[PDB]
Amino acid sequence: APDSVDYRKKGYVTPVKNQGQCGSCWAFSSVGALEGQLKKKTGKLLNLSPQNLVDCVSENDGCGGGYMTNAFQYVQKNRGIDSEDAYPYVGQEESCMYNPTGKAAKCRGYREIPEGNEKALKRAVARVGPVSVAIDASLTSFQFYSKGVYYDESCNSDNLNHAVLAVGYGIQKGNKHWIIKNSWGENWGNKGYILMARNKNNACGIANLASFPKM
Numbered sequence: 001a002p003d004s005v006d007y008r009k010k011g012y013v014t015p016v017k018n019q020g021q022c023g024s025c026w027a028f029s030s031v032g033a034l035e036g037q038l039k040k041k042t043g044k045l046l047n048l049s050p051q052n053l054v055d056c057v058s059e060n061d062g063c064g065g066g067y068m069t070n071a072f073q074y075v076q077k078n079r080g081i082d083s084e085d086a087y088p089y090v091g092q093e094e095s096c097m098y099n100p101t102g103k104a105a106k107c108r109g110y111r112e113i114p115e116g117n118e119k120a121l122k123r124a125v126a127r128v129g130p131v132s133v134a135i136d137a138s139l140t141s142f143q144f145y146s147k148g149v150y151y152d153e154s155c156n157s158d159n160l161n162h163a164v165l166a167v168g169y170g171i172q173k174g175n176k177h178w179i180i181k182n183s184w185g186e187n188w189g190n191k192g193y194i195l196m197a198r199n200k201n202n203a204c205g206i207a208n209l210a211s212f213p214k215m
């Protein structure tokens with residue numbers, strides 16, 4: 001078995017979503033990490049509610065942005081997270097309207113990838129499934145990506161600003177990569193995804209704030 005894997009084939013990832021006019025990339029990165037663990041722990045693939053995290057994770061800033069841990073931690077002490085269907089996405093901070101009857105998953109903590117260790121992140125993705133990662137996506141070469149293994153020597157590992165989802169890793173034209181799932185719609189990048197340089201010195205700081213939830 002070639003040392004590369006795409007959890008999309010395994011059935012661990014749901015369709016690509018679009019956050020609309022909202023800075024909720026942290027909420028989708030989290031959800032997809034949970035969506036992945038849920039399918040591992042129970043064999044079911046469901047769409048979890050990111051609106052849930054936007055409206056209720058007060059450790060974050062709604063559409064103003066946020067981090068994934070604070071999200072996983074909320075699910076923990078909340079004893080659950082609704083599903084997309086129970087808590088639909090409207091693309092705008094509203095009042096928390098969490099419904100326990102909607103609860104479609106939960107988690108007993110999370111684990112961080114050691115900072116800047118692509119080896120670690122590789123193992124994780126391999127042994128756990130979709131991992132949540134943060135990156136530098138402010139560059140225009142990113143925003144207009146469409147094919148091949150991305151890499152811009154102007155990416156700044158210290159300027160993380162986007163929460164995306166590692167869902168695999170492989171090799172294209174001999175170029176090691178990271179299958180990344182974005183939340184800007186299916187018409188962005190390549191059907192919503194984007195291959196990002198792997199082992200090229202932690203490009204855009206891919207493994208600089210990596211994490212996944214414990215279920």
Ligand SMILES: *[C@]1(=O)[C]N(C(=O)[C]C2=[C][C]=[C]C(C3=[C][C]=[C][C]=N3)=[C]2)[C][C][C][C]1[N]C(=O)[C]([C][C]([C])[C])[N]C(=O)C1=[C]C2=C([C]=[C]C(O[C][C]N3[C][C]O[C][C]3)=[C]2)O1
Pocket residue numbers: 019020021022023024025026058059060061063064065066067068133134135143160161162163184188209
């Ligand atoms: C993400 O959404 C990433 N960003 C975007 O994606 C912008 C965008 C939006 C819509 C469409 C498109 C697009 C682009 C190209 C083609 C098509 N469409 C793009 C940019 C910014 C917004 C958001 N970023 C984040 O959330 C970061 C992520 C992190 C680096 C992983 N985080 C933050 O911005 C952030 C985290 C915060 C914060 C403010 C306060 C915080 O602490 C609160 C602490 N306190 C609260 C009370 O309770 C106790 C704790 C944390 O900002």
